[PDB]
Amino acid sequence: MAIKLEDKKAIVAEVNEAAKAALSAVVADARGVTVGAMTGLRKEAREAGVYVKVVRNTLLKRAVEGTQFDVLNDVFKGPTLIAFSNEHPGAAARIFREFAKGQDKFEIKAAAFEGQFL
Amino acid sequence: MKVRASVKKLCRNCKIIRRDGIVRVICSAEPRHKQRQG
């Protein structure tokens, strides 16, 4: 368990720091994916440009204070697979179409292209 | 059943219970870990 000192009060800020650099964000219920299948997906953020990660739900809701994806407060529940797209505005939800094409998972809760509640 | 003056856990599945004034060990993995008295 992360303590409030070593982490849990710094990694909350880092995603908020990286929040104010992106144009799109697709949140998916990434539960049940194999380590290789995620790795195959994880070998795409370095190619097309993405900030895909998973964080605590409560920290994520407290990480939007920078006014980047405030429209996701009502959807900040369940599993999280935040996929901030900074370079090449968008271009990740298209990969999500490729990512969810071969899987039954990736329900994809919402997309945050600019100010937009999906 | 093993009856000893010193009864205790032998694995992570063993439980200490008090059943009608007697200390017992019941295990759901090995039936060799059953114990009485102590």
Partner: protein
């Protein structure tokens, strides 16, 4: 179904423990792919390639170019590792043969991004003596 096939010859069952296993793949079936597994598929060495079944006893073969110790032995030429770590050394080279080895070895079998496979490739030989400084 993780397994191994001898390059250029699949008939030997004791060499691979064929027949009995997770699936029922034919022993003589893999002999055809053994021709494809030669020269560039670790000739003379037991390259391990896993197996899979499509419907019943398929011939789904794999490919592993060069393992880290296989590459380390190829890059060093030594005969064996050290039985006692941090006690015996055999001799190593600079951290430059690893870059060309990892570039060939990783390909898609490693998730390393940049100089990340350098630690992974050196990891297998890290405890086998032959300390490296440059």
């Amino acid at each position: 179904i993780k397994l191994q096939v001898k390059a250029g010859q699949a008939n030997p069952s004791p060499p691979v423990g064929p027949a009995l296993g997770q699936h029922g793949v034919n022993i003589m079936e893999f002999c055809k792919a053994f021709n494809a597994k030669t020269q560039g598929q670790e000739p003379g060495l037991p390259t391990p390639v896993i197996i899979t079944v499509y419907s019943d006893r398929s011939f789904t073969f794999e490919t592993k170019s060069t393992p880290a110790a296989v590459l380390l032995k190829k890059a060093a030429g030594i005969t064996s590792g050290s039985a006692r770590p941090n006690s015996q050394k055999v001799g190593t080279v600079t951290r430059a043969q690893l870059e060309e080895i990892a570039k060939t070895k990783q390909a898609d079998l490693t998730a390393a991004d940049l100089d990340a496979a350098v630690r992974t490739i050196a990891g297998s030989a890290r405890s086998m003596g032959l300390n490296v400084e440059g």
